[model samples]
Target: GAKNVLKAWLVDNTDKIFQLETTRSIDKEIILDRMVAKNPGVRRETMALGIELMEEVVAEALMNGESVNTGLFRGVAQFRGVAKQNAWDAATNSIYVSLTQGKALREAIKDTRVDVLGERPTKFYIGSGQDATTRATDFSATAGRNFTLFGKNLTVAGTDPSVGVTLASAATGTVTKIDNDMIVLNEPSRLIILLPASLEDGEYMLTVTTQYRGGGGALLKTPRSTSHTIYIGGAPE
Candidate 1:
């Protein structure tokens, strides 16, 4: 009887919270869109909030066994059982949503499962670059997916030349394969890659490229680029 009462109260409260948050979020988006449409100076802050709100709503619905957006109440059980196939089916429905929504959201949700269920073999990513100084960048195994480290070219007048660019340390995983272009690191619990640390500590560009293949052999590719100038010492004269 206590469990039943608690479940009923939880469902009611969750529904109330979802409705209030969604309405407020939609109203905020309306104002934001109007400002952007009328004024050329309004930035895109609302877009990020909108995305966060959508994610929160979906997460709450799933966790509370509530229906999301007028659909059947498909909770985590359904997601676990049919996420892969449903994701693929949804992918064919919407191209843009397929790329980011299906792929990115699926990965995020899957990762959350590991965190929640205490599963071993977590997947993650980190920067690959050279270490030339005595100071080494330590890698943490607890760092979740998307962890990145930056390297700079630090060969200056008084520095040791023996400290050429080298991988500061190896990431935690089995070195599956190393090739001219890529090094694959495989963990029994998950799939990951440790980039070669051959970059000197200096101003250099960074690029990330990703390729995903569904169980049915459908392929998806995504790429991102960033540039940062790292200074190991005092400011340049």
Candidate 2:
């Protein structure tokens, strides 16, 4: 049997525990092909069909609050966060489907090998933000207000046509870009943006794209992006 190899990016957490981020996700089609190739006379169609059927059954059972064992893993419905006796509050309660490795999965990975490529390169990221006008930091912002973001390498500067701030509606996937004139101030560590006045009352996913690489440094070949979810017409707690 061929040995299983798990390659990942080594991430440093300052002085705390390190994390391993997998390089890529192996999709179902690729996994099916690999399984069929290793097992002679086992066609891809058969493997795919079995996988899909198992997924359907497991999903159905979990949704019904029934435990499911699919050889590789066991799944069950679990609840988290504080709940009220009156009703399930979306803001404080959440339901998650939990999956634990089963005996079969543990045995298969008993001899798996790991390969740490190197420390991950520093990259841009979005951090906690606030709306200066409403003084909201709880993921809620007022429409047509100034939103300030604190992050690294966030300056909106690049020759590319796609570099800027964009807000996409979570319900309809409609995109709205903040015009260059709306950018109050753009710097590597802070960005003050005047949100669009026409923004509707709903959930939006805000994205920032840039090619900034630090002071006077050459622009990256490709832009980096970070996203944060925000809400309009919602009370911030």
Candidate 3:
């Protein structure tokens, strides 16, 4: 999806470039070559990103038993010395990581791609103990109700005593809880808890607790809770 968006933008820009009446067909290649020759720095950065994306796609297809068409793929051949070696090493490492991590690597690459491409508003579904009907979406803290935030090492901060808790600690917040698979923020009203700045760059869980506010302070309790495993990186491959 993210690549689709990027491709769309690239197509639009190409169209605009070609729309120029003065831009001759030969001028296009001339301009590109001159730009790259004039700005080696920009060329290096572009090549780095291109190699990363290309290697990721190839590795994924290879792992899936799909044919990898390389006839149209041209390796970067301009760089000399360290730059060229670094580019080659980076591509090799990306594929090696994919093979070692398997599905998780692919998913991470996908998430990273989406993030780098500026895709937003991604949704994730998490599991819960309650039934689907009783599932709660409100992220807050209250008596009886609880929530969780899951990850490797996490720290939380808030006013309520149970508001912030780390995954390492067996700590449970009145409105939030941190478990192996979910981070639940229990609040009768909708509330947003700030994530720990030190949170690792990978997928984790987020949970919310629902219950009636005030009065008996009982949990309104949804039948089921949602869980999401999200990746937090800039680029996928």
Candidate 4:
């Protein structure tokens, strides 16, 4: 609370003042580096990576019906605002996280809830697919090899997020093209893609995400199953 003002239209005064605040934002890397300067014994690299690994674990914990509490940061997950009762049925994506902090986190009267999303998120995921022993995981492919992806909703309908191919390592896949024999407007239920030609050496999971019909991105229900992987040419991997 800062100032209180009166308005002439409603009272005898005309001008009013609004209290404002500015926030300081810093990237995690700087925070990690800062910690290192304060504690020389800590490996900045390992602690820094722990931060990266924690969020995924948090998300997984939320989906597992557990709240993440390291005694300070807490993430209590919930799902709502669906286009349907089953919008989250392992069927779609482009979901938003409803982050409503209470107590020292939120202050309000009545429904003080809010709606928001990650800032143009620069990060993402490779979800799931062939495990270490899965026979398919043993297959190989380079830039020149093209493969077909069979799925029920290769293309979805209704309001959906921007759809595109996501090739990544658990850490990269590469230059590539994808298509099927059909009109671009009418995406097929199954499609094929040309493996990266100049793809670097790394086993990359090939996944695509977007809300199909109307659904949320969170694992509100069973999420998208791992469907593909591109074996980029590398050390006999």
- For model 2, the run of ten residues with the poorest summed lDDT: 11-20
Error of 3 at 87 (Å): 29
RMSD per candidate (Å) reads 23.2, 9.2, 21.0, 18.4
Q: In model 1, where do residues sit more than 4 Å from their true spots?
A: 1-35, 38-57, 70-182, 185-237
**Candidate number with the higher TM-score (3 or 4):** 4
The residue-by-residue lDDT of candidate 2 on 1-237, one tens digit each, is 437876655432333222334233344777888887788789788788998998888788899989988667888998766768978888877676667899888877876776766654665755557887546665667667788886667898778889999988866789998897888989887888888777777778889988888667999788878777777653322
Winner by TM-score: 2
Better of 2 and 4 by lDDT: 2
Clash count, one per candidate:
9, 0, 35, 5
- Which one wins by TM-score: 1 or 4? 4
Select the stronger candidate by TM-score from 1 and 3. Answer: 3
Q: Find the candidate with the highest lDDT and give its number.
A: 2
Better of 1 and 4 by lDDT: 4
Candidate 4 structure, TM-score to reference: 0.31
The order by descending lDDT is: 2, 4, 3, 1
Local distance difference test values of all predictions, in order? 0.30, 0.74, 0.33, 0.43
- As a whole number from 0 to 100, the lDDT of residue 217 in candidate 4 is 41
Model 1 TM-score is 0.19
List model 1 lDDT by residue over 107-207, tens digit each.
Answer: 44444421121211212222232222212322221111122343211111112222111222112212222232232332211223333333222222222
